Structure formats: C-alpha cells, structure tokens
C-alpha cells in the first residue's frame with residue numbers, strides 16, 4: 001500500500017505536490033482539481049514551515065490556495081475557511097501591499113506575498129493521504 005501517489009511528498013497524513021510547470025492562479029486550482037487535489041490550504045503552523053521550506057529551497061515562486069477575490073482585504077482559503085490572525089505573521093514584512101491590485105497569495109522567500117492572480121507561477125497541490 002502507498003500513502004501518497006508516485007513521487008509526491010508526504011507530511012503529517014497529507015500528500016503534497018509541487019508543479020514543474022507554471023500556471024496562473026485559477027489554472028492552478030484547476031490543475032489540482034484535475035488530480036483530485038486542492039491548491040494547498042495551510043491548516044497548521046508546522047505545515048506552513050514545511051511548505052515554506054520546500055518552496056524556498058527550490059527557488060520557485062509558488063501559488064497557494066488563498067485569495068481576497070470575495071472582497072478586498074478579506075483573505076480566505078479556497079475551502080471557504082478564513083485567514084486566521086495567527087497565520088497573518090507568515091506574510092512577508094510590508095505585505096500584503098496590493099501594489100497594482102493583487103488578490104492572490106504565493107510563497108516568496110521567507111513568507112507570503114500578494115501578487116496578481118493572472119501572473120503565472122508554480123503551485124502546490126494537497127490531498128488527504130490514503131489509509132493502509
């Protein structure tokens with residue numbers, strides 16, 4: 001039995017996957033849906049540091065499933081769940097700044113940054129690990 005698919009990464013009962021091509025934010029969640037996964041929604045502190053590490057050490061700007069397209073200033077994960085105050089420390093200093101209108105969040109260096117959703121970047125999918 002295999003808890004995660006071929007060449008996916010495993011962490012705390014979940015299966016993650018960093019793309020090796022680039023897409024815009026909407027095309028990215030589509031991509032994850034195509035594999036029965038979701039553009040990552042972070043739920044733990046350790047999950048953040050885990051993903052933030054894989055993303056940085058590959059020197060790749062990476063989409064995550066977080067946006068404010070429901071309403072400006074209201075950051076909300078693609079599962080509807082809101083962005084908790086606890087998680088707001090993971091923004092990069094001076095972010096989110098909404099320079100030129102920016103409604104989607106990405107892994108950039110040590111933390112997160114808001115960028116333009118139509119800007120093409122890499123992405124990370126998340127799904128529940130299978131039971132053995």
Ligand SMILES: NC[C@H](O)CO[C@H]1O[C@H](CO)[C@@H](O)[C@H](O)[C@@H]1n1cc(-c2ccccc2)nn1
Nearest residue numbers: 061094095097098099102106108113114115116
């Ligand atoms: N992958 C994105 C990468 O991290 C680059 O980040 C920067 O440019 C991104 C633009 O693509 C921003 O969305 C980030 O906020 C960040 N920025 C931009 C600015 C800024 C402010 C005033 C005038 C001009 C520029 N201040 N911070």
Ligand SMILES: [Ca+2]
Nearest residue numbers: 068098102103
């Ligand atoms: Ca914004």
Ligand SMILES: [Ca+2]
Nearest residue numbers: 097098113114
């Ligand atoms: Ca920004």
